[PDB]
Amino acid sequence: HWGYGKHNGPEHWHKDFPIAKGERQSPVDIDTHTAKYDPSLKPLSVSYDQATSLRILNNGHSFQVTFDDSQDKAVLKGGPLDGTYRLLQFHFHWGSLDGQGSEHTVDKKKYAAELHLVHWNTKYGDVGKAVQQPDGLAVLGIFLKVGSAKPGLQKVVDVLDSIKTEGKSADFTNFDPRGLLPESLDYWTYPGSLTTPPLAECVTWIVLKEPISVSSEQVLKFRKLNFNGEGEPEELMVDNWRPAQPLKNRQIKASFK
């Protein structure tokens, strides 16, 4: 199966998922000087007050916290979006060292990690249906830099020892994702894709300008996870990021001057 290694990594994915070479792939480099300020973009509306987290899972490519998306409890609205998008899960991409790990880049700068909060458009009823639509998904992307600890991330970090290997999961109730957001909701937006197989071109990307800071001890715990199943040779889950893809005929828009 696909992965992030020499033999199965991003430059190989097009063989099983030919859309990898498509017209609206993600991530991209965000050239801050070429992004156009669009004064008609609305502020983003993040309503996570009623979010219900369920489980945390090592899926062999990242770890994810999954939410109850059977009602409008944690939704994303406004911004460049038409309609209501329910929060399904969040996960991260990170590096083997602090100088890489983010999928989006800003004027070619890589961050140590990138948080993706994945939402789907309720007009399509379910995520499987939504990934087949050009406005099916909205992913809120947040950069992580290394410095001060993020207190709101610690509950996550502390359970990772229990989901070390691919397929392990644990109960992960009462986690509040509001503790992962930066102060500002200023953002860049562009039409793109999933950054993992199946690389479906169904995503409105919303990438926040302001990074969150996490501690070296927090990111070090991400790097103790494993790509492999229990009983297989130990391969650390590091560098699980797709490089920037060609922008082609797309315009990146900014919410802010």
The residue from 7, 12, 33, 61 that is catalytic is: 61
Q: Is 189 annotated as a binding residue?
A: no
CA distances from 72 to 124, 236, 239 (A): 13, 36, 34
- Give the binding range for Zn ion (CB under 5 A) out of 23-31, 51-59, 110-118, 183-191: 110-118
Asked if 214 is part of the footprint of ligand Q3K (rule: CB under 6 A), the reply reads: no
Residues 6+ apart with CB under 8 A from 216: 98, 146
Q: Is 116 annotated as a binding residue?
A: yes
- Residue 204 main-chain phi, psi, to 5 deg: -90, 110
DSSP helix/strand/coil, 144: strand
- Say how far apart CA 252 and CA 245 lie, in whole Å: 14
Asked if 57 is part of the footprint of ligand Q3K (rule: CB under 6 A), the reply reads: no
7 is catalytic: no
Binding ligand Q3K (rule: CB under 6 A), the pick from 139, 153, 180, 219 is 139
Asked if 116 is part of the footprint of Zn ion (rule: CB under 5 A), the reply reads: yes
Q: Is 173 annotated as a binding residue?
A: no
Considering the complex, state which of residue 51 and residue 199 has its C-beta at the smaller distance from ligand Q3K. Answer: 199
Asked if 202 is part of the footprint of ligand Q3K (rule: CB under 6 A), the reply reads: no
Residue 22's binding partner among ligand Q3K, Zn ion, none (Cβ under 5 to 8 angstroms by kind) is none
Handedness of CA 214, 67, 65, 169 (dihedral sign): positive
Strand partners, 65: 56, 90
Asked if 66 is part of the footprint of ligand Q3K (rule: CB under 6 A), the reply reads: no
CB-based burial label for 40 (10 Å; 0-12, 13-18, 19+): exposed
Q: Is 104 annotated as a binding residue?
A: no
> Could you tell me which residues are annotated as the binding site for substrate?
195-196
Residues assigned a catalytic role: 61
